From a paper:
The overall structures of CaRai1, AgRai1 and SsRai1 are similar to those of SpRai1 (16), KlDxo1 (18), and MmDXO.
There are essentially no conformational changes in CaRai1 upon RNA binding, with rms distance of 0.38 Å for the Cα atoms of the two structures. CaRai1 had very low activity in our biochemical assays except for decapping toward unmethylated RNA. The CaRai1 and SsRai1 structures are especially similar, consistent with the 58% sequence identity between them. The αC helix is absent in AgRai1 but contains more than four turns in CaRai1 and SsRai1, which also have a longer αD helix.
Author numbering: 1 to 391
The structure:
């Protein structure tokens, strides 16, 4: 049985906390995490207009694509806690936050209002005065699986192959737009030979930030694509220099104008939540050749969506970013006023049910609440480490 939040809930408040990076960690070419010197894993954006003019083929190398199987690539709470231990150890203290979770989780919530057909299924878990929130993985995988089989069964073999190559365009773009070190420390041939480099999606640089909304405090782990220019030593300045990289088809008609608006909004959700101030889009034609690249400043995106004449639509259907924010804040304040964070015996389920227009918080089963507390979310080491701070 459930508590539910009217989908028309909107905070009035939106006092906004300035995001700040706490630490980072990484994943390597084989899937393994890395807690020491993760900065060695941070690439740097490098893609001069002159080179774009060469007409880079974003499907070069498709065949050799080194791709992590989906099950291995679910947002991993184990490594993150493991990462979190290291940093709290050093601080001599635990992170002040009302919530701790991956940021894709919050992106979905923040973007829900204009993505009303997309389910959301997550677990919520009280522990040490804080809420821990991971995604119902089982469910997720089973959808990706069944969505996969639809796409295969309802399309021609060529249309399916093309969709698969589009998925690769994203990684390939990241590969030919970044360099592993800054410009000063990299050779001219390391630069000119990126287009041959074998593409993988194993390697990741992950940042854990502290942020907040109204009077609630959040910690978000999320992936960062690269650094814009350089990475300052100064802690509270690092987020200002990351870039998100995306790619999109060139825009031909009005139908694509709105499709692009909706992508751009999603991306603004992700980056706003993370404090990433820069979004680059590489626009590629139907032969998956890169045509031009355009940088957006995150904080300007709301203004561009509001003022597009082509996409003036119905108030309830028009993307407004503030209105989503007011929704977001109304969500987290609900999570923050509904669960006794201190009561660490039961867990919950966040469900958004698209068919039933329901946003439900409901207590989980008892085995449920167990396995989350014993290895599925919380780990022996983290649980242990966290208690020993009062002892």
């Amino acid at each position: 049985m459930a508590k539910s939040l009217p989908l028309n809930s909107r905070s009035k408040t939106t006092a906004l906390k300035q995001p700040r990076e706490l630490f980072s960690y990484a994943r390597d070419i084989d899937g393994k995490y890395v807690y020491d010197d993760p900065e060695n894993s941070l690439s740097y954006y490098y893609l001069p207009d002159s080179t774009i003019d060469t007409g880079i083929d974003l499907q070069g190398g498709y065949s050799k694509f080194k791709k992590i199987p989906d099950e291995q690539n679910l947002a991993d709470f184990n490594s993150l806690l493991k990462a979190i231990i290291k940093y709290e150890t050093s601080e001599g203290k635990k992170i002040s936050s009302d919530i701790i979770t991956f940021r894709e989780i919050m992106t979905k919530i923040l973007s829900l209002p204009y993505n009303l057909t997309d389910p959301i299924d997550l677990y919520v878990v009280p522990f040490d005065g804080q809420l821990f929130i991971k995604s119902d993985d089982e469910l997720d995988m089973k959808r990706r699986k069944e969505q996969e089989v639809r796409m295969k069964q309802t399309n021609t073999v060529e249309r399916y192959d093309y969709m698969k190559r589009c998925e690769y365009v994203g990684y390939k773009f990241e590969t030919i737009a970044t360099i592993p070190k800054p410009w000063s420390q990299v050779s001219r041939s390391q630069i000119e030979n990126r287009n041959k480099k074998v593409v993988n999606n194993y390697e990741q640089y992950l940042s854990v930030i502290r942020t907040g909304i109204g009077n609630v405090k959040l910690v978000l782990a999320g992936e960062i694509d690269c650094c814009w220019d350089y990475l300052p030593d100064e802690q509270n300045k690092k987020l200002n220099h990351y870039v998100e990289l995306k790619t999109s088809r060139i825009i031909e008609n009005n139908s694509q104008v709105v499709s692009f608006e909706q992508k751009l909004f999603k991306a603004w959700c992700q980056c706003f939540l993370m404090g990433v101030t820069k979004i680059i889009y590489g626009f590629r034609d139907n032969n998956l050749i890169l045509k031009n690249v355009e940088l957006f400043n995150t904080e300007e995106i709301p203004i561009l969506i509001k003022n597009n004449p082509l996409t003036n639509a119905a108030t309830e259907k028009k993307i407004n970013c503030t209105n989503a924010l007011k929704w977001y804040g109304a969500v987290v304040d609900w999570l923050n006023t509904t669960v006794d964070k201190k009561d660490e015996i039961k867990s919950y389920r966040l469900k958004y049910d698209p068919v039933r227009k329901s946003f439900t918080l409901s207590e989980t089963d008892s085995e449920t609440n167990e396995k989350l507390r014993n290895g599925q979310l919380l780990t022996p080491e983290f649980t242990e480490w966290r208690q020993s701070l009062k002892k």
